[PDB]
């Protein structure tokens, strides 16, 4: 239903919040990496916005993001959680029980986000491109990309987003 938005908003605030706490991020802190074009391939009703919450410590960031994501997921009801494993496999190719999720995610993140491909990126303006997202006819889905300020930080944010968008495929029949 429309709680999917309730959730993405909870996440967006919890993320924006922990970065500020666990990493001294702020709306007015220099940004190494800036977001360029942020769009979706198959956009069936998702309005996108980018927010800056930059800080210098990429690892403090990555930890805050995983943290928020874990807190948020832990807030879902047993009934809701059950749909997550499917999203996972759909957006990443990874089996997972309703428990091993949190862990499996962390592993995926840690690996991916530390890849040379990622950490070695010295390209200042980076484009975020998800590929599918849906929104109800009445109300569209609002997605916000929180720019951590680092290639490694945004890598986590992006992975999170890829999952989120795969959950919007469930609201729209």
């Amino acid at each position, epitope marked *: 239903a429309a709680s999917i938005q309730t959730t993405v908003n909870t996440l967006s605030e919890r993320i924006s919040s922990k970065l500020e706490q666990e990493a*001294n991020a*702020s709306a*007015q*802190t*220099k940004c*190494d*990496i800036e977001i360029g074009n942020f769009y979706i391939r198959q956009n069936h009703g998702c309005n996108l916005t980018v927010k800056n919450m*930059c*800080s*210098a*410590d*990429a*690892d*403090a960031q990555l930890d805050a993001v995983l943290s928020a994501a874990t807190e948020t997921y832990s807030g879902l009801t047993p009934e809701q959680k059950a749909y997550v494993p499917a999203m996972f496999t759909a957006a990443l190719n990874i089996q997972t029980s309703v428990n091993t999720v949190v862990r499996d995610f962390e592993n995926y993140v840690k690996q991916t986000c530390n890849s040379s491909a990622v*950490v070695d990126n*010295k390209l*200042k303006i980076q484009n975020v491109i998800i590929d599918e997202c849906y929104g109800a006819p009445g109300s569209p889905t609002n997605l916000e990309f929180i720019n951590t300020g*680092s*290639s*490694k930080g945004n890598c986590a944010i992006k992975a999170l987003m890829q999952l989120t968008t795969k959950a919007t495929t469930q609201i729209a029949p």
Partner: antibody
Amino acid sequence: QVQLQQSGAELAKPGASVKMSCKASGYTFTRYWMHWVKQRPGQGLEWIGYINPSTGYTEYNQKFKDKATLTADKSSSTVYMQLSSLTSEDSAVYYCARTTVDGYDFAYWGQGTLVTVSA
Amino acid sequence: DMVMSQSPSSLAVSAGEKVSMSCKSSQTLLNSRTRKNYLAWYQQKPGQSPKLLIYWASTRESGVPDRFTGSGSGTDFTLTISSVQAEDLAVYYCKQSYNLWTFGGGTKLEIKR
């Protein structure tokens, strides 16, 4: 207290290279950006480039792009700046500075490292 | 690209008197949205390292006496020392942090005696 210890003075032959250091302590190394600045005897300050200790991300002044190279060792909490193909024009004192929280201004400075390029 | 012009190059003043120097950029350092001016002032006393005095166009850095005042906006800024003292002898540099970083040529402050 916050403190930045830069290496000692240096004398190099023209065409040679040199590599200075800045040892940081008294704050989380990975929480602030580190900038470098040049100053020829009797002249003003000049921005060279900066580096993010945590990610190794760097950006230089177009003017120094091929002369200076910034690196950082998180395990030792020290930042290195290396100058190549030296010339009399490179003779000056170099400073490392830790930024403020927002990363825009230089809150703390090293004592500087004087480099002399002469045969 | 970006060019910082300070003026005058140097000025003499006696202790007690007041002074003002100018810093002008070839580009605006103001962020319309936030109202922030990405410009700071640095003091460098003979034989020493540069010290941060004012950041954000007018905010005093911790421990800096209030006789130092940062003003201006957009592309015209002024540093003002209410009542200079011998110890204030130094060269003052203004630096922009909007589009990368740039220092002015500085204004050498001399003391009349």
